[PDB]
Symmetry: D2
Subunit: 440 residues, 4 copies
Amino acid sequence: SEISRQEFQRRRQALVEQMQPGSAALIFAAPEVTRSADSEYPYRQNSDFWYFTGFNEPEAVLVLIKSDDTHNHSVLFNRVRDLTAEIWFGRRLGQDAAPEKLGVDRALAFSEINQQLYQLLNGLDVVYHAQGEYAYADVIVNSALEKLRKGSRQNLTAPATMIDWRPVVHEMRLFKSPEEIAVLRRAGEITAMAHTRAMEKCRPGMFEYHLEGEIHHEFNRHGARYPSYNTIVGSGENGCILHYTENECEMRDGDLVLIDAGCEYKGYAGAITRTFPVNGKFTQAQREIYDIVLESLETSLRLYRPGTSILEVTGEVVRIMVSGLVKLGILKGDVDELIAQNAHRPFFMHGLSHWLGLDVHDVGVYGQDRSRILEPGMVLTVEPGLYIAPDAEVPEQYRGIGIRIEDDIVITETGNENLTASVVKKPEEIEALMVAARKQ
Amino acid sequence: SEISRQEFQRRRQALVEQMQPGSAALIFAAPEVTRSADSEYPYRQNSDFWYFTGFNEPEAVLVLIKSDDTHNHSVLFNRVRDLTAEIWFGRRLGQDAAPEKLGVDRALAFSEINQQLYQLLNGLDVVYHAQGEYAYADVIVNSALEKLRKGSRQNLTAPATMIDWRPVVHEMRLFKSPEEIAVLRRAGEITAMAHTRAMEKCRPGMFEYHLEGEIHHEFNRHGARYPSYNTIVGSGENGCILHYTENECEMRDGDLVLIDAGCEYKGYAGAITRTFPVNGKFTQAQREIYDIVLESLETSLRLYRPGTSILEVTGEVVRIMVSGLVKLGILKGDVDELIAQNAHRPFFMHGLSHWLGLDVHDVGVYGQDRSRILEPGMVLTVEPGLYIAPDAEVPEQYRGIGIRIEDDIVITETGNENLTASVVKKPEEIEALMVAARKQ
Amino acid sequence: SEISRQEFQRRRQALVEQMQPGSAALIFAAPEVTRSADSEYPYRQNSDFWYFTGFNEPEAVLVLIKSDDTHNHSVLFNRVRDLTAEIWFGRRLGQDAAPEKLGVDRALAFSEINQQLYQLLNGLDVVYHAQGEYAYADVIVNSALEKLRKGSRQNLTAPATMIDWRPVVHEMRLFKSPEEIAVLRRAGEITAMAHTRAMEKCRPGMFEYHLEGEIHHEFNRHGARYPSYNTIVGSGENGCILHYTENECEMRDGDLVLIDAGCEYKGYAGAITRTFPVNGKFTQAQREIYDIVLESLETSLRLYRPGTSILEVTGEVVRIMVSGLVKLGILKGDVDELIAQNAHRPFFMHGLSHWLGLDVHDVGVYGQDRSRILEPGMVLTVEPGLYIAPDAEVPEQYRGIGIRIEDDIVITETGNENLTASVVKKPEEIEALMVAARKQ
Amino acid sequence: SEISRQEFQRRRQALVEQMQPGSAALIFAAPEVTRSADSEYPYRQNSDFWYFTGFNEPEAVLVLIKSDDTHNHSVLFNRVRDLTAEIWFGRRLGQDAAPEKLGVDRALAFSEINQQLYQLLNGLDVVYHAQGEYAYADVIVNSALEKLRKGSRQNLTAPATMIDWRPVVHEMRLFKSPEEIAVLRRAGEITAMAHTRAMEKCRPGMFEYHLEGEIHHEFNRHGARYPSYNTIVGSGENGCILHYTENECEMRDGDLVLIDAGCEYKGYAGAITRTFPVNGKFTQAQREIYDIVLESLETSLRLYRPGTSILEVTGEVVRIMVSGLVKLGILKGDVDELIAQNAHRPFFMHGLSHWLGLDVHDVGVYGQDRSRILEPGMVLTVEPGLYIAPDAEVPEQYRGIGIRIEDDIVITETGNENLTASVVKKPEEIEALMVAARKQ
Ligand SMILES: [Mg+2]
Ligand SMILES: [Mg+2]
Ligand SMILES: [Mg+2]
Ligand SMILES: [Mg+2]
Ligand code: NA
Ligand code: NA
Ligand code: NA
Ligand code: NA
């Protein structure tokens, strides 16, 4: 699926509806980013700029101006067309084509921004600006406001009020529209296909990075060129490191491998974690830990619905975890006391869920301890895990095991929809998939 | 192959040999780089820092101190070990293990650098520093020198001389050792295997990005996780854009596809360009242009040897090109006059060769117009191309054709060695490879 | 006179009354200012900080916090007491004595500001800050707001709205209270005594700087240690330069001398300009120009009252000037046409009046072309002048004459009060004063 | 006296003689300095810029270029002439008049510096620059060097070596020429006349600031418009504060007053301190302390000569002081032991002598503990003092006494010349001067 021209227009209007009359909002593009010397990384647009434009160039600024409650318009500053610069570095939109292509009322050259921006802000009461996001942007904005402040003999006046639009825009981004959900739904299918493929390709003697290669190839072939985050392939003890990205080790028969990977499809992030045996067959010790993480996931997927919270569901996961670990002799004592002492924290030291969207760790207010009441349109990860350190004082057979299982969901009117359920997570289904692949 | 501990030691000593007595050289690691919000790009070490250390962490500084012509030592500042930071973001070397692992005499915590660096620079005459490379580094160095300048009542004195070490270090990097050549030799084999695979997989109806996926998968499977630059797959008119990286178009029967891709293997860059027909069979018009570019490459490979220059060989390429284009009726006039008017420039607008090493566009002085005399150990690309614009005033059949063929070579005592010859470039060999693959 | 503790309290409350509930206002002290190497200029407090505190130290910040419409409090950050720093650089207020001495509720050490300010701003809706006034202040404020923005897991939130308090505070400063007027009244008496003394001391053969010395001595002896601006003593052609401060020339018999000087008394600026003959007797040519400037001043002093404007009175001055210059043959043509062509501008190129207070060119909105309606409590200068360049194409006898006469006034319920009338300006009174002095 | 055109030329040549061939030295003018809002302090040129030019404008840069051991030239960047800017803010030198007036070979507009400076530095080996002195200067220099570094395709190269010229220039400034000594000699006469006048004007009931006024008036009348530092008038307990500049107290019969003041004459600083009784008659307790400080001064003036050091003479002063304080019962114990314990430090906590020149605390290397061997042409202060705190545990009659007596001297071939001896310091001579004045 994709995001339509009309959707980008609706988003801008939704922002304008919330702005004060006599105001302007400034949204700046991301700068290009050096990898080494003269070579740059693949360009990644600022998520907020992208949200309002679907425009993937640097040196661009969107200005939305609200004159009053019925009148408003949009100006884009963007790179000029240039034959020499384009024969080298590829095509640019320019000013002539921008109004039509992007649905803005006016487009100006980014090279003229210091001569034009103060003219757009003159006499307004409020400017909405994300201060400290990018240094180049603060320079441009502070420079416009200084001209206006010092220009009273030329009948210029500066807006005295500056408001951060991020709280407002992040609240919009927190609730996904049907179009956004269709995109994320496809991101989830793509990400799942990559995880199925890694399970099917994994053999003892392959390196962790080989599975990374299979995953990226699968993303690419469905049109997701880049991952939404650095892929994690942690076999054995490397699975106890939460963001292990070295992916440098030989995968050994007897070990588990934890794969945490997600594609970026039309800007939107998938995020799946699967843990599975390198040799296609879980040991008893591995099943004992795996079943605790899986029950935590399956219970969470049953509970998440409008009217509950991440905090409330986390409480139920903690109970499942402490209960399971007491039965294995990994924790000792009374379950209720151990829960009150947060005795699970050495083994499960991260949150259960985070928002998901244009960023893998998405924007939006969580509330104290993630107590915010869930409502339809919210998209989140559910990612329980247990990590037993190599030197943990526990029975030998559980030391050095890291297991995480993560699904992505959207809250619906009556419950949730699982966007990532097309990759298996039940241990018998994992084993059948790997056996079937090893034949073929 | 790889670079040994002993090689990194030799490089540091070679730098120290050139330093003044009573001096210190400061080499700073690259900062981490944001992709979007809280997520970062895969870390890429500064090439000069990497050259002297093979150490792939941020927040690190190498200080080499020459007391006199027989005494010198090395201090490393680097991140401290930290259980919580490592359970999350993975393992760190720390101070205890650094002296041995990296062959430095002393290692200190990067968090103490502002309390320790001025003590290392006190009373020295010269400091070697790459000013303006990184802002965080200039802050650290200017801050140390200000303490010393203002500390005469505490018997501190600053070095009055600051020298840029980049000219010296870039002259070292320009001449590759046998170990470096073995690494680059393998980078070339890997890069060639990726290009062969793309030729074998290409079918009409695939998208440009699908070939990018095949290439990256092939890099990865030989241990080159990342490309050395953003892969270019330009089919049809997209081949006229020199650094086209959108790779967004459907590849059409009848078109050529230009693939410019290179792996990064142990820090070193491969760089190959191949142009070939999407449908596996060159048309007459396509052969006519291709043969000019190929003769330019083959002649260049014959000529490059110690004692000549990039400028001298470029002169011979220009002659081949203008001569070929006059025979096709793309240029009109006398060949010698057209050469004197630089009449090839609309069609061939970049250099023939650049240095190659830890950076794809490597460091090293070229001399005026690239007239520097070539010597053994220099590694370069040879990359002739012809690009006829869609709207060029030339016979219709040549409009919208972009063809580049690039090989990587090292200058040897008697000539050169071609590091990338294991991927085919003769048109009949390309066609046979694609036919063989289409059967299967 | 002086400004009472109670007055500073009323001003702070007047600011708080205008603030939104759930907000804080930050007012930063001026930094110390280098004259040369290690030596500094006499400290001059920021006018806005001074206005609210009467506290003459650097490294101080006033924070006014409005919790709601009935509750608010004040925190001062200021330098800690320190025996060694004080034996050297003199006494400091410290934290213990500040609440009582300055009438603030709490005082904290300036050295702890980065650890305490974000705690004061946490959870507020609005912060009032003069952005771009001082760089050290912006660093402190941006740093507090970044901690809050990134501290949601610690239950911190930043105020999303930032408002410039300068418009509000400058509107307060524009209207002087009775206490302020008593201070300015004394500043005017002191400044007048200095100008009388310069007229009485002036002899041919003295240097311009000698009169500067007499003026500064007179300021000092009444308790005004510093001038409010760099004293101007322009004799002859130097009087045509509006802010001549070289004061380097020998004063010649036959020349006029223009003295523009003003004391700073309790922070408040006097500003008087007088022009008079070096030899104590005006020539006919000098009287002809002087009488035009004097009529402009005397008429202005009659007209200024509530309900008129600087623009309206300037119109009447322009008429007097153009009329006078036509009678001398300095302008040729019809008076109404010459007025419409602004034909006075080569000879009178500055404004008639500016606001006066804690700054000589004081804060406050003038309106387009200085059209703002005057109201009681406004304090302004009235400073007509005529400057005929040495090379002006006018009758020889008027070339190189610069004449300015400036008085300071406060608008009252029925008219104005002249704060500077105790120094003579009528030519016969000037001459009598100088004759009497020469006997002384 | 004054400094000649020829002297400024000799200084520049002396710097050039020490520069490497193929180099340039950049000396930047001081920026203008805000006092309050739009008003600025009296301009004070950078001492090093002034030393080489005698040019008192901002926005100026001197570039001295040494091509080789016999060829060199000077370029000045300075403000362009501008009729409007000059009618307002006074006259400028401009480019046409600069070569002749200042003895430079070429003059360019400061507004073109970013377009011209890199052209002057292109292809040089060394640049001499005082890094971190002024931020605007570092911006200009870093910007020129970045253009050159990145301009190799345009055949530009940057100098790789940057050397701080301050050590060299400060060593030149440390040794005064005969012309400089004649200027300082007159600065000393002027400063002495001011101190004599303050002694003659002082009466009980005057404020400390009134004596400041008398002193500044006396400076001004001899052509020293500004003090070289903020005048100190500390009566009573205020004399125990080393840099007391509040000068706010009523001078009381029975108290001493310590006056520390110095004029700035042609850029050069006088610096005299005198202590004397407000009522013109020393008490016994006051004489007891005064005689110790005076013996310290008189002995120092006998000892200072080529071949000794500030450290060596300080040792003799410490002995005189500890010996005197033991006789008064202010210190108890054996003199040699008390000296070894540095028992004088509570009462005499600053150095005896500092260099004096264009800065009151002048440039030049002192050596460890000020052990540098004195040579002819060095100019220094000799300023012993004793400060007994109000709460010191000593006999009551000595509490709250601060006494400093300071003279300025130049080292000569056989001894020293006292530049400030024309103001009295013997107590009977002080008393006779004050009695004579009271009759006024
Ligand atoms: Mg195990
Ligand atoms: Mg065609
Ligand atoms: Mg005349
Ligand atoms: Mg006493
Ligand atoms: Na996640
Ligand atoms: Na290349
Ligand atoms: Na004025
Ligand atoms: Na002194």
